[PDB]
Structure 1
Amino acid sequence: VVGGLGGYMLGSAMSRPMIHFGNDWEDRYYRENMYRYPNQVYYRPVDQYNNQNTFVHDCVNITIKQHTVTTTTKGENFTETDVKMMERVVEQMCVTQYQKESQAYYDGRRSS
């Protein structure tokens, strides 16, 4: 019984990028502890938004919202440090989910 998810789907599966955070430790931290974070993101149909940005943001928000709900309360806890890395990983994954969904929904589909 989610409260905040108007039928947001979950993507099929992806891989774990490296995220070049720019701190020497945000990298070393991340590469060690990456096994915690989802290898997936939640989204709505790209076709519903007119623009990538608003949509991919909504994908950051919703993915993390689904975790701070489902994954959390009585499971995991994303500390404030994780929270910042989640936003990094998930945005940089929502742009990938989109490089399928958008272009797949454009190449022989939309026309702008």
Structure 2
Amino acid sequence: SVVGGLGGYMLGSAMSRPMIHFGNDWEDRYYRENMYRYPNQVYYRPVDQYNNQNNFVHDCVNITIKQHTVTTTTKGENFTETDVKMMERVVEQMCVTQYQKESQAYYDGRRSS
């Protein structure tokens, strides 16, 4: 797929795509049925330019949303805020799990000790 809008984001490591407990049985299935649609990797930036944890993990995930939506559209498709909501919740914790490396690689910089 050709995102285009990724010229300085990079691709994470792939990982085990976590399930979620939405608390409600129709949403449990909604994700785990549609799960094949959802991205197996996340997109990110050097946390060297960031400061807040939150703001990075935000942009990380939300770029990983618009990567996936906009490289699905351009041919008579769109997402819905549901499939987005499900992806956000999963791609967040995935984005943390990849981030925790980028984060240590960052703190290793700073002056090394």
TM bin, normalised by shorter chain, reads 0.7 to 0.9
Deviation at 1:110, TM superposition (A): 6.2
CA distance in 1, matches of 2:39, 2:25: 23
Normalising by structure 1, we get a TM-score of 0.81
Comparing 76-85 with 39-48, greater Cα deviation is found at 76-85
Q: Aligned equivalents of 1:22 and 1:110: distance in 2?
A: 45
Question: Percent of counterpart pairs with the same letter?
Answer: 99
Question: Which range is displaced more, 69-78 or 92-101?
Answer: 69-78
Unaligned runs of 5+ in 1: none
Distance 1:110 1:60, change over 3 A: farther
Aligned partner of residue 48 in structure 2, secondary structure = helix
Deviates more, 1:102-111 or 1:25-34: 102-111
Q: In the alignment, what sits opposite 2:107?
A: 106
Return the alpha-carbon distance in structure 1 between the equivalents of residues 27 and 39 of structure 2.
18
Note the alpha carbon deviations across 1:14-67, whole angstroms, 9 max, x for none.
Answer: 121011122222112211221110011111012211121000000121111112
Aligned residues: 112
Quickly say closer, same or farther: Cα 1:69–1:104, change in 2 above 3 A: same
Which aligned segments of 4 or more residues in structure 1 are displaced greater than 6 angstroms? 108-112
Does the 8 Å CA contact 2:61/2:91 hold for their aligned counterparts? yes
Structure 2 residue runs of 5 or longer lacking an equivalent are none
TM-score (norm 2): 0.80
Question: RMSD in angstroms over aligned alpha carbons?
Answer: 2.6
Contact 2:13 2:98 (8 Å CA) reproduced: no
